[PDB]
Amino acid sequence: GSMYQLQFINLVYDTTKLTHLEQTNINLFIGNWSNHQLQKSICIRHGDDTSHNQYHILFIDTAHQRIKFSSFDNEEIIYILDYDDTQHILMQTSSKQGIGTSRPIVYERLV
């Protein structure tokens, strides 16, 4: 009996500038996802120039089925999302300039 924190992640990218593999790869992460131990949930969407909670894509990693991104308002935090299966993705955080990376955290599909 307890509230979760929800982080809205609106990714901004020009669908126009991507290979099809890249597009398939990003699309893996669009959806709503939760971790029950942390009581955290993320709602990932393809946003636009006008969305709030905007995040910039730094790199699309098709080889490992992964994307790296940062929030528009804090470039010192890098998020890494890895695809596991349609019901699970892994999110990790790291810093831009320092040393220390989080454990990959499992988020399972919901909604």
């Binding site: 790199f59 890098i78 892994l90 790291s94 810093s95 320092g98 040393i99 220390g100 990376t101 989080s102």
Partner: protein, 183 residues
């Protein structure tokens, strides 16, 4: 899914691990790896249980909100200054320490923290830094190994002494680019 198995066929001919080392806490959703590593190393060499990642990080980031603290990582100079603050003359050494050096440091109850960095595949692909703890060294199947602890884990890991390539959990690879020695 994954189970633990037996490893009957290994021949551990020699093992030398830091006196009093014990994994006491695990890193999840924060960037405190260096704090986890330093805490475990100092707990081992000081023979205590009072160090912990959160408290180290708080000391390094006294003005950051509790909410923003998880996202603070560690600079090399903080690793050095923090160790000194605890009575440890920390020195950086580039590259992977030799088996013989690890063996000597470990017998002298001196801790070593691994500084690792992922390998970028493009200019837009930022390499990531991570920190781990050396636990000691072993000769296994006639091969020299180093023993280390990734804060992500609850168990120890074994590294070929002649390799800088760390194959971490969740299939993440980092290179050991240097060490902070003296904890």
């Amino acid at each position: 899914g994954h189970h633990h198995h037996h490893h009957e066929f290994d021949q551990v001919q020699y093992e030398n691990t830091l006196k009093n080392f014990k994994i006491r806490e695990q890193q999840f959703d924060n960037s405190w790896a260096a704090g986890f590593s330093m805490a475990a190393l100092l707990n081992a060499t000081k023979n205590t249980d009072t160090y912990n990642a959160h408290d180290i990080m708080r000391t390094l980031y006294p003005e950051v909100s509790e909410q923003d603290l998880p996202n603070c990582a560690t600079f090399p100079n903080q690793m050095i200054e923090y160790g000194k603050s605890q009575g440890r003359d920390i020195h950086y050494q580039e590259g992977v320490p030799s088996y013989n050096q690890v063996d000597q440091l470990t017998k002298d109850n001196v801790g070593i923290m691994i500084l690792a960095q992922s390998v970028s595949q493009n200019p837009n692909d930022p390499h990531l830094g991570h920190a781990l703890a050396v636990v000691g060294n072993a000769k296994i199947n006639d091969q020299e190994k180093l023993i280390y602890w990734n804060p992500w884990d609850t168990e120890l890991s074994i590294q070929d002494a002649d390799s800088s390539l760390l194959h971490l959990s969740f299939n993440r690879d980092y290179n050991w680019y240097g060490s902070m020695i003296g904890y």
